[PDB]
Amino acid sequence: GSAPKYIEHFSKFSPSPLSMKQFLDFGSSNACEKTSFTFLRQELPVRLANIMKEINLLPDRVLSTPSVQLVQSWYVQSLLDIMEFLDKDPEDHRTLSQFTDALVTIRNRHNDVVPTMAQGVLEYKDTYGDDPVSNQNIQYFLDRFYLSRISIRMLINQHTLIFDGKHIGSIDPNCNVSEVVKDAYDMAKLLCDKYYMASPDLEIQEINAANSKQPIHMVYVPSHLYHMLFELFKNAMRATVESHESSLILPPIKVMVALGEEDLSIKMSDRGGGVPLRKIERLFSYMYSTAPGYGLPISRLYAKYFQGDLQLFSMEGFGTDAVIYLKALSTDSVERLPVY
């Protein structure tokens, strides 16, 4: 049993956040597999150890619960799996293939962590209550835990996608934002029609300030952008349809994509009746969003992961706006990791 020793050792290192350029360089060609392996066999234990150390610092009433113990056991095994490759020779192609297989196993091992943590939150509410102090501590920990998870899965996805034997792994250097908006809308519309037998239309407007006629493209991870937009579309469609049940006119959902000098901003606007300001905060709360999902708080973490943000503003009695803020320039797109 060396896991506590491993956690203590690697938690002494700070994680190394990567920029988009570094991600592109790692994924530029298959010749970089050895470089990716040498980087990851060190970086992954550092990122795993730092969050694992924070987990062990949780109060005993949280640490001893089955959900936390289960998740911690997954992290311990994944940490130990990566340790086997520290002494292995990068020049051996068998080492590289085994490392890629190990990463896929690690990724699959953690697939259910989000619902597992949600179960823990519900247990905490029923076992100790839902006071504001508990909400803040849970919010602080889960935001960091999930942001850490996003960063680790990003590293694993880039290695496995690229070194399997235009797009650079999960990164699209020429991501057309409006196309991703349409994809997320279409998926949300399909679910909306199945459940409600009615769906708002989509209106997309683009504002390219520097080049008015040019479609807006960026370097980004389209799956992350899809996840944020899909979650927002689901909320906007549900609100729009339900608030107009006794009405015939169904207002469309309006999306504006704006490209500025440093911001690429996406605003989604509905006329779904709005939310009082008092209730806005609870929409992003893990504790208050638990009931006997976490789409919005996690969506905000995806936005923050590359130095962006996700903000919500409503007008009760009318409708709601959500804005995804992203960095327009790849030079400004850098991993945001929990501060340890």
Ligand X SMILES: Cc1ccc2c(n1)[nH]c1c(C3CC3)cccc12
Residue from 235, 254, 327, 335 carrying the catalytic annotation: 235
Among 13, 74, 226, 313, interactor with a second copy by CB under 8 A = 313
Say which residue the tokens 């797109």 belong to: 333
Distance CA 153, CA 234 (A): 25
Q: Which residue lies nearer to ligand X by CB, 222 or 272?
A: 272
Q: Which stretch binds ligand X (CB under 6 A): 113-121, 146-154, 198-206, 265-273?
A: 265-273
Nearer to Cl ion, 3 or 113 (CB): 113
Going by their DSSP bridges, the two strands 263-269 and 172-176 should be labelled as unpaired
User: Which two tokens mark 61?
Assistant: 């009433």
Sign of the CA dihedral 106, 221, 38, 44?
negative
DSSP 247-298: -S--PPEEEEEEE-SSEEEEEEE--S----HHHHHHHT-HHHH-----HHHH
Exactly one of 273, 304, 311, 336 binds ligand X (CB under 6 A); that residue is: 273
Q: Is 137 annotated as a binding residue?
A: no
* 7-15, 84-92, 152-160, 315-323 -> range binding ligand X (CB under 6 A): 315-323
- Cβ nearer to ligand X, comparing 79 with 184: 184
In 3D space, the residue among 219, 302, 208 whose CA is nearest the CA of residue 257 turns out to be 208
Alpha carbon distance 207, 231 (integer Å): 23
141 annotated as belonging to a binding site for a ligand:
no
Binding site for a second copy (CB under 8 A): 207-210, 256, 258-263, 265, 267, 273-274, 276-278, 309, 311, 313-318, 321, 323, 325
Residues annotated as part of the active site: 227, 231, 234-235
User: Residue ranges for the binding site?
Assistant: 231-238, 270, 289-290, 293-296
User: Residue ranges for the binding site for ATP?
Assistant: 231-238, 270, 289-290, 293-296
